[model samples]
Target: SKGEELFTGVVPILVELDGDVNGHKFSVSGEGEGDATYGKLTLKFICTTGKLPVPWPTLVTTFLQCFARYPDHMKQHDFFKSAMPEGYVQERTIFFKDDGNYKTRAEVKFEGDTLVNRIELKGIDFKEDGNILGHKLEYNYNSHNVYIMADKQKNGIKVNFKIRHNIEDGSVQLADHYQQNTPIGDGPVLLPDNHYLSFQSALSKDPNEKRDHMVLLEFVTAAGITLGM
Candidate 1:
């Protein structure tokens, strides 16, 4: 009963990280929904403590259609539009886990005219430990085509990814060579590389401490109503 709603936009995508990894707790709430083919949708990612273990802005783009789904507000943002001449649809403000006062405003855009073989990110006004920098960061991805994900196939591996972002130097780097989307199921929350966040194990040195994690990335048909957009 709930399974259909998960894929069909009855419930928002639940993205959570429920364990203590080096003193960081990754618990987030957000939803995504729209026509992914054209990349038209309403999406959001909010963390209570404003901290994330991964570069969510980049990871979410891997699964959701952010580039093709342009919003009017993003069009008006001078900084966002100037960085993405190819055109951008989604713009978001993300607080850095490494720095409290330092945050990044990023934008997403598609690379192809017909078939979207790649997606790009233009992130500007980065900061390190509350100090703003002038250099703009760029992100690129060719894996997991939006069209294939829209097909709803359940054949891929579980979503487990190891992302390393050196916020000090102002670079967000994802290390996983190949990324695939596993079907969201009734089991535990999964990461991008298809590995489930197990409560029985710890990614840290404390063997006694299990890794309790949750990552809820959902899609709702009526996203505007669900997300209050």
Candidate 2:
């Protein structure tokens, strides 16, 4: 819901920041606060090599998933990707009491290489009364495994749904982890150390097939990743 549509085709900007943007940390402002959608109100944080101006696309999606889901939610000409091969970690946390009542939180981290992107968020809208959202999506690009968990409560009623997909072995199971509130276990969006709890050894480890090499980058309307064949 966070300007998901406005980002159709946005690119990441790969560049170094000079100083504080708009005299504020990360250079965030009130522009596009509400005009887009309910997501506009979503406060976010984008990390890079240096302190730089946050881009528009980063407002909507994670810098890591930029390789995958963004194709469907494709962001247009905007800063997000950088020119630097050594990418930065972009993270956001919504722990503050919003204009609404409840708590809306999101945390994302991505590396240019090594391919491990974790995205965890619960309710972009923190309005307490009728808005309780439980959402979690994590994909290990290296493992070729994806875990998705989501639940919601509206009007004081609750519902839950989940599924995990192993792309390498082509298997599915009841998804686990990515729940927001709990007293223990891997900080909610759980990535259990137990590897292949549901599937056998991964496909790539066969050592019989050649692998496709990939790269990632720049700035604050920036760079777009192209999958070469």
Candidate 3:
């Protein structure tokens, strides 16, 4: 069962906060897919900070966290879901809840020196469900020449998508392919003990309100982990 063997069967664990403020912490613990070894997976923490009247910081943090953690999954989901927009034509199109009005779709591609990538979102929309929204997102990524020159790269990853709206005279131009960084890992790569200090330092100047309330620490497996009899 190579497919099964290559999938991580870790159950997602979460720590519920006991405060009036809304937030939750989570982690992944389970067996690795390539080997029977255990995997320590982590996801980005989405949080917010700001005054009670307007928690823009909290909303931004939460959005960014979710954006980074689930870009691949969200892109795939959007690609498939967009196929039948007319079918769900009960006077209201059921947009993917996770597919925010403003989305930054991402993909990785390894092709010689030049890698193709794309990121886009619909600018505006009007729906019969009485839900109106707008979107604007973009990306900027690159890789080292040494990494690209090396033929060690296995598969070419390409991330691309478009944005759409039901409103009249509202359409945004989408990108076909954009470049991205070479080294992207699916799971966590570093230990909390080694990076927590750096994390604290980076956020020291920022107000507590801007810090992520929930953090998902991840550790990625090296290629060598796949070696076996």
Best by lDDT: 1
Q: What TM-score would candidate 2 get against the native?
A: 0.20
- State the lDDT of candidate 3 residue by residue for 8-102, as single tens digits: 24333222111121122222111111111322333233332222211121111111011111122122221111211111100111233333122
Candidate 3 at 154: error in angstroms? 9.7
**What does the lDDT read for residue 43 in candidate 2?**
22
Query: What does candidate 2's lDDT look like per residue over 57-78, in tens digits?
Result: 2122222322223232223311
Worst 10 residues of 1 by lDDT: 194-203
Q: Which rank order by lDDT, best down to worst? A: 1, 2, 3
lDDT score for residue 138 of model 1: 33
lDDT scores in order: 0.29, 0.23, 0.21
Which lDDT tens digits does candidate 1 get at residues 28-109? 4444344422334343445455544444433443333222222333222112123222322322232333432212222233
Residue 104 in candidate 3 has what lDDT? 30
Cα RMSD (angstroms) for every candidate in the order listed: 17.9, 19.1, 19.0
